Amino acid sequence: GMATLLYLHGFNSSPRSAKATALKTWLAQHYPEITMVVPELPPYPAETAELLESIVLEHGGEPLGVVGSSLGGYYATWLSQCFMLPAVVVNPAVRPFELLNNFLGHNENPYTGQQYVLESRHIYDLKVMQIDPLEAPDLLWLLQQTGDEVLDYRQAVHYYASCRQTVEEGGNHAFVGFDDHFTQIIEFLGLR
Ligand SMILES: [Ca+2]
Ligand SMILES: [Ca+2]
Ligand SMILES: [Cl-]
């Protein structure tokens, strides 16, 4: 049983994302005692929730912290507040029903090639994982760049107002300079 970092990728991303790979390589070099779990998330929110529950069951006997990017940050917030886990959320989607609206219909993940159909019922499924009000804001750290061209940064800054925040002017949705924050991330998550 080791401490574990759980990384949650964004919608239509994958575990081979640049951020996930950079963190996995850095963690293996500097903190090999912290294992990294990076699941391939189903596109269907109800099924993502069930998979994440099984991961928390498996890893909950040891320190466990979550990092999530974009929609992965929305899932990380739900895990944080439902399972009392610390989480760092990176350019998170806080109104994901608007985010996923333009993924309705048939889709193919550009990383993995998986084909899937997103239906309106899936968006309603995502809404049930919405946390409002935040009951344990001390468990969350928002990392946000104002230059995010996909999401309006102001939504996250307001939603996470009672949490630790690092808001950087400029940047983009992919989050520039993610690696500059890695030691502070492991410290916030209680894994160091
Ligand atoms: Ca573990
Ligand atoms: Ca579309
Ligand atoms: Cl996303």
Side-chain angles (χ1 to χ4, degrees):
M2 338 306 306
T4 295
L5 190 153
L6 173 63
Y7 184 93
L8 306 184
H9 65 75
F11 198 79
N12 246 22
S13 194
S14 91
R16 291 193 82 161
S17 93
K19 293 200 277 307
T21 299
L23 178 56
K24 197 143 199 293
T25 294
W26 179 95
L27 206 58
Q29 166 158 22
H30 300 286
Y31 298 93
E33 67 268 28
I34 303 176
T35 64
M36 196 138 162
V37 176
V38 197
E40 205 187 329
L41 303 171
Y44 320 109
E47 310 325 326
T48 297
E50 301 266 31
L51 180 63
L52 294 178
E53 282 184 72
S54 87
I55 292 166
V56 173
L57 172 65
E58 164 154 46
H59 289 283
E62 314 99 30
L64 176 62
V66 192
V67 180
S69 166
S70 203
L71 190 58
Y74 181 87
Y75 292 129
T77 298
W78 171 75
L79 283 185
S80 171
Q81 299 296 283
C82 284
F83 295 95
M84 275 318 95
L85 299 171
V88 181
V89 297
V90 186
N91 290 341
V94 298
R95 298 233 181 211
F97 26 84
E98 97 191 20
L99 187 37
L100 293 186
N101 179 262
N102 284 351
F103 290 94
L104 288 173
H106 185 268
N107 292 274
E108 196 196 313
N109 185 300
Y111 288 64
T112 70
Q114 174 202 31
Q115 307 218 328
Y116 62 92
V117 177
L118 196 72
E119 294 282 325
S120 313
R121 66 181 169 87
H122 292 125
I123 293 188
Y124 281 89
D125 286 343
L126 199 60
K127 295 166 163 133
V128 317
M129 269 173 286
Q130 180 72 288
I131 306 291
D132 196 313
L134 283 177
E135 49 289 54
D138 296 351
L139 292 177
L140 288 158
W141 178 19
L142 170 68
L143 289 182
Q144 181 67 51
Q145 297 187 334
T146 69
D148 189 325
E149 74 274 12
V150 176
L151 305 177
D152 183 350
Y153 80 93
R154 291 170 307 161
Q155 299 174 343
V157 169
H158 171 269
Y159 176 78
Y160 296 102
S162 282
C163 310
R164 183 176 173 181
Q165 296 189 357
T166 302
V167 182
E168 302 190 327
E169 293 176 25
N172 57 34
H173 183 56
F175 201 92
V176 183
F178 184 44
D179 56 308
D180 294 333
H181 304 276
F182 285 172
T183 302
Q184 276 325 287
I185 285 169
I186 264 51
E187 185 226 321
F188 179 80
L189 292 179
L191 304 177
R192 208 184 149 171

PDB file of all heavy atoms in Angstrom, residues 76-98:
ATOM      1  N   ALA A  76     -13.167  15.343 -10.627  1.00  0.00           N
ATOM      2  CA  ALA A  76     -12.309  15.393  -9.438  1.00  0.00           C
ATOM      3  C   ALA A  76     -13.018  16.119  -8.303  1.00  0.00           C
ATOM      4  O   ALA A  76     -12.853  15.765  -7.127  1.00  0.00           O
ATOM      5  CB  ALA A  76     -10.973  16.059  -9.766  1.00  0.00           C
ATOM      6  N   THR A  77     -13.776  17.164  -8.632  1.00  0.00           N
ATOM      7  CA  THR A  77     -14.523  17.903  -7.616  1.00  0.00           C
ATOM      8  C   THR A  77     -15.571  17.013  -6.954  1.00  0.00           C
ATOM      9  O   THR A  77     -15.740  17.056  -5.724  1.00  0.00           O
ATOM     10  CB  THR A  77     -15.150  19.122  -8.270  1.00  0.00           C
ATOM     11  OG1 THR A  77     -14.108  19.977  -8.781  1.00  0.00           O
ATOM     12  CG2 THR A  77     -15.957  19.926  -7.276  1.00  0.00           C
ATOM     13  N   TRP A  78     -16.308  16.241  -7.757  1.00  0.00           N
ATOM     14  CA  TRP A  78     -17.269  15.295  -7.212  1.00  0.00           C
ATOM     15  C   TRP A  78     -16.566  14.281  -6.321  1.00  0.00           C
ATOM     16  O   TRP A  78     -16.982  14.079  -5.180  1.00  0.00           O
ATOM     17  CB  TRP A  78     -18.019  14.634  -8.374  1.00  0.00           C
ATOM     18  CG  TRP A  78     -18.876  13.508  -7.994  1.00  0.00           C
ATOM     19  CD1 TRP A  78     -20.068  13.582  -7.378  1.00  0.00           C
ATOM     20  CD2 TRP A  78     -18.610  12.130  -8.227  1.00  0.00           C
ATOM     21  NE1 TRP A  78     -20.586  12.321  -7.212  1.00  0.00           N
ATOM     22  CE2 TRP A  78     -19.691  11.412  -7.704  1.00  0.00           C
ATOM     23  CE3 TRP A  78     -17.545  11.435  -8.810  1.00  0.00           C
ATOM     24  CZ2 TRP A  78     -19.759  10.015  -7.763  1.00  0.00           C
ATOM     25  CZ3 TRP A  78     -17.622  10.050  -8.871  1.00  0.00           C
ATOM     26  CH2 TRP A  78     -18.702   9.367  -8.325  1.00  0.00           C
ATOM     27  N   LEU A  79     -15.447  13.702  -6.778  1.00  0.00           N
ATOM     28  CA  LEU A  79     -14.744  12.757  -5.907  1.00  0.00           C
ATOM     29  C   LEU A  79     -14.292  13.418  -4.611  1.00  0.00           C
ATOM     30  O   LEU A  79     -14.406  12.838  -3.522  1.00  0.00           O
ATOM     31  CB  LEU A  79     -13.535  12.194  -6.617  1.00  0.00           C
ATOM     32  CG  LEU A  79     -13.733  11.133  -7.638  1.00  0.00           C
ATOM     33  CD1 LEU A  79     -12.347  10.652  -8.111  1.00  0.00           C
ATOM     34  CD2 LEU A  79     -14.557   9.956  -7.160  1.00  0.00           C
ATOM     35  N   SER A  80     -13.721  14.620  -4.717  1.00  0.00           N
ATOM     36  CA  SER A  80     -13.247  15.331  -3.540  1.00  0.00           C
ATOM     37  C   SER A  80     -14.335  15.474  -2.500  1.00  0.00           C
ATOM     38  O   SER A  80     -14.121  15.235  -1.304  1.00  0.00           O
ATOM     39  CB  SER A  80     -12.741  16.720  -3.955  1.00  0.00           C
ATOM     40  OG  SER A  80     -12.463  17.488  -2.828  1.00  0.00           O
ATOM     41  N   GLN A  81     -15.508  15.909  -2.929  1.00  0.00           N
ATOM     42  CA  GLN A  81     -16.529  16.329  -1.996  1.00  0.00           C
ATOM     43  C   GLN A  81     -17.402  15.176  -1.546  1.00  0.00           C
ATOM     44  O   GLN A  81     -17.974  15.237  -0.451  1.00  0.00           O
ATOM     45  CB  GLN A  81     -17.379  17.427  -2.643  1.00  0.00           C
ATOM     46  CG  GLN A  81     -16.575  18.684  -3.020  1.00  0.00           C
ATOM     47  CD  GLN A  81     -15.984  19.398  -1.811  1.00  0.00           C
ATOM     48  OE1 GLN A  81     -16.690  20.105  -1.094  1.00  0.00           O
ATOM     49  NE2 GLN A  81     -14.680  19.248  -1.612  1.00  0.00           N
ATOM     50  N   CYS A  82     -17.488  14.130  -2.338  1.00  0.00           N
ATOM     51  CA  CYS A  82     -18.221  12.934  -1.950  1.00  0.00           C
ATOM     52  C   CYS A  82     -17.379  11.975  -1.132  1.00  0.00           C
ATOM     53  O   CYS A  82     -17.916  11.311  -0.244  1.00  0.00           O
ATOM     54  CB  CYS A  82     -18.736  12.254  -3.207  1.00  0.00           C
ATOM     55  SG  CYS A  82     -20.159  13.115  -3.873  1.00  0.00           S
ATOM     56  N   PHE A  83     -16.072  11.885  -1.387  1.00  0.00           N
ATOM     57  CA  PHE A  83     -15.224  10.925  -0.694  1.00  0.00           C
ATOM     58  C   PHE A  83     -14.207  11.596   0.222  1.00  0.00           C
ATOM     59  O   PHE A  83     -13.387  10.908   0.827  1.00  0.00           O
ATOM     60  CB  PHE A  83     -14.520  10.004  -1.710  1.00  0.00           C
ATOM     61  CG  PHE A  83     -15.475   9.123  -2.484  1.00  0.00           C
ATOM     62  CD1 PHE A  83     -15.949   9.498  -3.720  1.00  0.00           C
ATOM     63  CD2 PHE A  83     -15.922   7.930  -1.932  1.00  0.00           C
ATOM     64  CE1 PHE A  83     -16.846   8.691  -4.417  1.00  0.00           C
ATOM     65  CE2 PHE A  83     -16.818   7.119  -2.619  1.00  0.00           C
ATOM     66  CZ  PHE A  83     -17.278   7.502  -3.862  1.00  0.00           C
ATOM     67  N   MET A  84     -14.274  12.917   0.382  1.00  0.00           N
ATOM     68  CA  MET A  84     -13.427  13.644   1.333  1.00  0.00           C
ATOM     69  C   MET A  84     -11.951  13.487   0.955  1.00  0.00           C
ATOM     70  O   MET A  84     -11.081  13.252   1.795  1.00  0.00           O
ATOM     71  CB  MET A  84     -13.708  13.172   2.766  1.00  0.00           C
ATOM     72  CG  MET A  84     -14.893  13.839   3.491  1.00  0.00           C
ATOM     73  SD  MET A  84     -15.162  15.630   3.346  1.00  0.00           S
ATOM     74  CE  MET A  84     -16.346  15.707   2.022  1.00  0.00           C
ATOM     75  N   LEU A  85     -11.676  13.645  -0.331  1.00  0.00           N
ATOM     76  CA  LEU A  85     -10.338  13.504  -0.912  1.00  0.00           C
ATOM     77  C   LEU A  85      -9.833  14.876  -1.342  1.00  0.00           C
ATOM     78  O   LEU A  85     -10.611  15.676  -1.864  1.00  0.00           O
ATOM     79  CB  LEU A  85     -10.332  12.580  -2.128  1.00  0.00           C
ATOM     80  CG  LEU A  85     -10.764  11.132  -1.953  1.00  0.00           C
ATOM     81  CD1 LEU A  85     -10.901  10.461  -3.288  1.00  0.00           C
ATOM     82  CD2 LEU A  85      -9.751  10.409  -1.113  1.00  0.00           C
ATOM     83  N   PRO A  86      -8.549  15.175  -1.178  1.00  0.00           N
ATOM     84  CA  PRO A  86      -8.012  16.422  -1.752  1.00  0.00           C
ATOM     85  C   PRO A  86      -7.915  16.318  -3.273  1.00  0.00           C
ATOM     86  O   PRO A  86      -7.618  15.257  -3.839  1.00  0.00           O
ATOM     87  CB  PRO A  86      -6.627  16.539  -1.101  1.00  0.00           C
ATOM     88  CG  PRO A  86      -6.208  15.094  -0.891  1.00  0.00           C
ATOM     89  CD  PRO A  86      -7.493  14.341  -0.561  1.00  0.00           C
ATOM     90  N   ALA A  87      -8.073  17.469  -3.938  1.00  0.00           N
ATOM     91  CA  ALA A  87      -8.034  17.497  -5.388  1.00  0.00           C
ATOM     92  C   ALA A  87      -7.511  18.842  -5.872  1.00  0.00           C
ATOM     93  O   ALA A  87      -7.847  19.878  -5.313  1.00  0.00           O
ATOM     94  CB  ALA A  87      -9.408  17.239  -6.004  1.00  0.00           C
ATOM     95  N   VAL A  88      -6.722  18.784  -6.938  1.00  0.00           N
ATOM     96  CA  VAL A  88      -6.242  19.938  -7.685  1.00  0.00           C
ATOM     97  C   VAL A  88      -6.964  19.907  -9.006  1.00  0.00           C
ATOM     98  O   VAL A  88      -6.946  18.877  -9.696  1.00  0.00           O
ATOM     99  CB  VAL A  88      -4.723  19.885  -7.902  1.00  0.00           C
ATOM    100  CG1 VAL A  88      -4.277  21.113  -8.649  1.00  0.00           C
ATOM    101  CG2 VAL A  88      -4.025  19.801  -6.553  1.00  0.00           C
ATOM    102  N   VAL A  89      -7.644  20.996  -9.350  1.00  0.00           N
ATOM    103  CA  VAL A  89      -8.453  21.069 -10.565  1.00  0.00           C
ATOM    104  C   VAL A  89      -7.832  22.110 -11.483  1.00  0.00           C
ATOM    105  O   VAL A  89      -7.569  23.240 -11.069  1.00  0.00           O
ATOM    106  CB  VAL A  89      -9.935  21.336 -10.228  1.00  0.00           C
ATOM    107  CG1 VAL A  89     -10.454  20.161  -9.418  1.00  0.00           C
ATOM    108  CG2 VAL A  89     -10.157  22.625  -9.439  1.00  0.00           C
ATOM    109  N   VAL A  90      -7.564  21.697 -12.719  1.00  0.00           N
ATOM    110  CA  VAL A  90      -6.766  22.442 -13.679  1.00  0.00           C
ATOM    111  C   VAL A  90      -7.676  22.859 -14.827  1.00  0.00           C
ATOM    112  O   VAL A  90      -8.218  21.997 -15.528  1.00  0.00           O
ATOM    113  CB  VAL A  90      -5.583  21.605 -14.192  1.00  0.00           C
ATOM    114  CG1 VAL A  90      -4.685  22.415 -15.077  1.00  0.00           C
ATOM    115  CG2 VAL A  90      -4.813  21.009 -13.024  1.00  0.00           C
ATOM    116  N   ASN A  91      -7.873  24.162 -14.996  1.00  0.00           N
ATOM    117  CA  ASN A  91      -8.814  24.705 -15.971  1.00  0.00           C
ATOM    118  C   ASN A  91     -10.091  23.880 -15.983  1.00  0.00           C
ATOM    119  O   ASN A  91     -10.493  23.345 -17.037  1.00  0.00           O
ATOM    120  CB  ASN A  91      -8.175  24.774 -17.376  1.00  0.00           C
ATOM    121  CG  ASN A  91      -7.097  25.835 -17.486  1.00  0.00           C
ATOM    122  OD1 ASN A  91      -7.015  26.765 -16.674  1.00  0.00           O
ATOM    123  ND2 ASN A  91      -6.266  25.740 -18.529  1.00  0.00           N
ATOM    124  N   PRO A  92     -10.739  23.709 -14.828  1.00  0.00           N
ATOM    125  CA  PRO A  92     -11.890  22.808 -14.753  1.00  0.00           C
ATOM    126  C   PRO A  92     -13.133  23.362 -15.433  1.00  0.00           C
ATOM    127  O   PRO A  92     -13.396  24.558 -15.460  1.00  0.00           O
ATOM    128  CB  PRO A  92     -12.141  22.674 -13.243  1.00  0.00           C
ATOM    129  CG  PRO A  92     -11.661  23.993 -12.686  1.00  0.00           C
ATOM    130  CD  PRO A  92     -10.442  24.339 -13.521  1.00  0.00           C
ATOM    131  N   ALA A  93     -13.940  22.441 -15.929  1.00  0.00           N
ATOM    132  CA  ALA A  93     -15.254  22.756 -16.449  1.00  0.00           C
ATOM    133  C   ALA A  93     -16.235  22.751 -15.284  1.00  0.00           C
ATOM    134  O   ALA A  93     -16.390  21.726 -14.616  1.00  0.00           O
ATOM    135  CB  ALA A  93     -15.647  21.733 -17.510  1.00  0.00           C
ATOM    136  N   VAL A  94     -16.877  23.876 -15.017  1.00  0.00           N
ATOM    137  CA  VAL A  94     -17.847  23.923 -13.929  1.00  0.00           C
ATOM    138  C   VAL A  94     -19.278  23.956 -14.417  1.00  0.00           C
ATOM    139  O   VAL A  94     -20.189  23.725 -13.608  1.00  0.00           O
ATOM    140  CB  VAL A  94     -17.583  25.109 -12.982  1.00  0.00           C
ATOM    141  CG1 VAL A  94     -16.216  24.951 -12.339  1.00  0.00           C
ATOM    142  CG2 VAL A  94     -17.715  26.398 -13.728  1.00  0.00           C
ATOM    143  N   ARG A  95     -19.513  24.265 -15.686  1.00  0.00           N
ATOM    144  CA  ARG A  95     -20.838  24.216 -16.301  1.00  0.00           C
ATOM    145  C   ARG A  95     -20.777  23.176 -17.419  1.00  0.00           C
ATOM    146  O   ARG A  95     -20.950  23.486 -18.600  1.00  0.00           O
ATOM    147  CB  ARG A  95     -21.246  25.593 -16.810  1.00  0.00           C
ATOM    148  CG  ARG A  95     -21.360  26.641 -15.677  1.00  0.00           C
ATOM    149  CD  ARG A  95     -22.722  27.335 -15.707  1.00  0.00           C
ATOM    150  NE  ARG A  95     -22.886  28.362 -14.682  1.00  0.00           N
ATOM    151  CZ  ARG A  95     -24.044  28.685 -14.115  1.00  0.00           C
ATOM    152  NH1 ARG A  95     -25.175  28.079 -14.451  1.00  0.00           N
ATOM    153  NH2 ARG A  95     -24.072  29.646 -13.195  1.00  0.00           N
ATOM    154  N   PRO A  96     -20.493  21.925 -17.077  1.00  0.00           N
ATOM    155  CA  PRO A  96     -20.167  20.960 -18.131  1.00  0.00           C
ATOM    156  C   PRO A  96     -21.351  20.624 -19.019  1.00  0.00           C
ATOM    157  O   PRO A  96     -21.143  20.094 -20.114  1.00  0.00           O
ATOM    158  CB  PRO A  96     -19.663  19.748 -17.337  1.00  0.00           C
ATOM    159  CG  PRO A  96     -20.512  19.794 -16.097  1.00  0.00           C
ATOM    160  CD  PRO A  96     -20.588  21.276 -15.755  1.00  0.00           C
ATOM    161  N   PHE A  97     -22.582  20.951 -18.603  1.00  0.00           N
ATOM    162  CA  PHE A  97     -23.735  20.756 -19.473  1.00  0.00           C
ATOM    163  C   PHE A  97     -23.649  21.626 -20.719  1.00  0.00           C
ATOM    164  O   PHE A  97     -24.038  21.198 -21.810  1.00  0.00           O
ATOM    165  CB  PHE A  97     -25.011  21.062 -18.704  1.00  0.00           C
ATOM    166  CG  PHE A  97     -24.802  22.018 -17.595  1.00  0.00           C
ATOM    167  CD1 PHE A  97     -24.814  23.367 -17.841  1.00  0.00           C
ATOM    168  CD2 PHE A  97     -24.533  21.564 -16.308  1.00  0.00           C
ATOM    169  CE1 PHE A  97     -24.590  24.241 -16.852  1.00  0.00           C
ATOM    170  CE2 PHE A  97     -24.307  22.457 -15.296  1.00  0.00           C
ATOM    171  CZ  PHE A  97     -24.340  23.797 -15.565  1.00  0.00           C
ATOM    172  N   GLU A  98     -23.147  22.856 -20.579  1.00  0.00           N
ATOM    173  CA  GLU A  98     -22.883  23.668 -21.761  1.00  0.00           C
ATOM    174  C   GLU A  98     -21.690  23.115 -22.534  1.00  0.00           C
ATOM    175  O   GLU A  98     -21.746  22.995 -23.763  1.00  0.00           O
ATOM    176  CB  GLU A  98     -22.723  25.139 -21.347  1.00  0.00           C
ATOM    177  CG  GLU A  98     -21.325  25.685 -21.151  1.00  0.00           C
ATOM    178  CD  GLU A  98     -21.325  27.080 -20.490  1.00  0.00           C
ATOM    179  OE1 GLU A  98     -22.343  27.452 -19.859  1.00  0.00           O
ATOM    180  OE2 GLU A  98     -20.312  27.805 -20.612  1.00  0.00           O
TER     181      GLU A  98
END
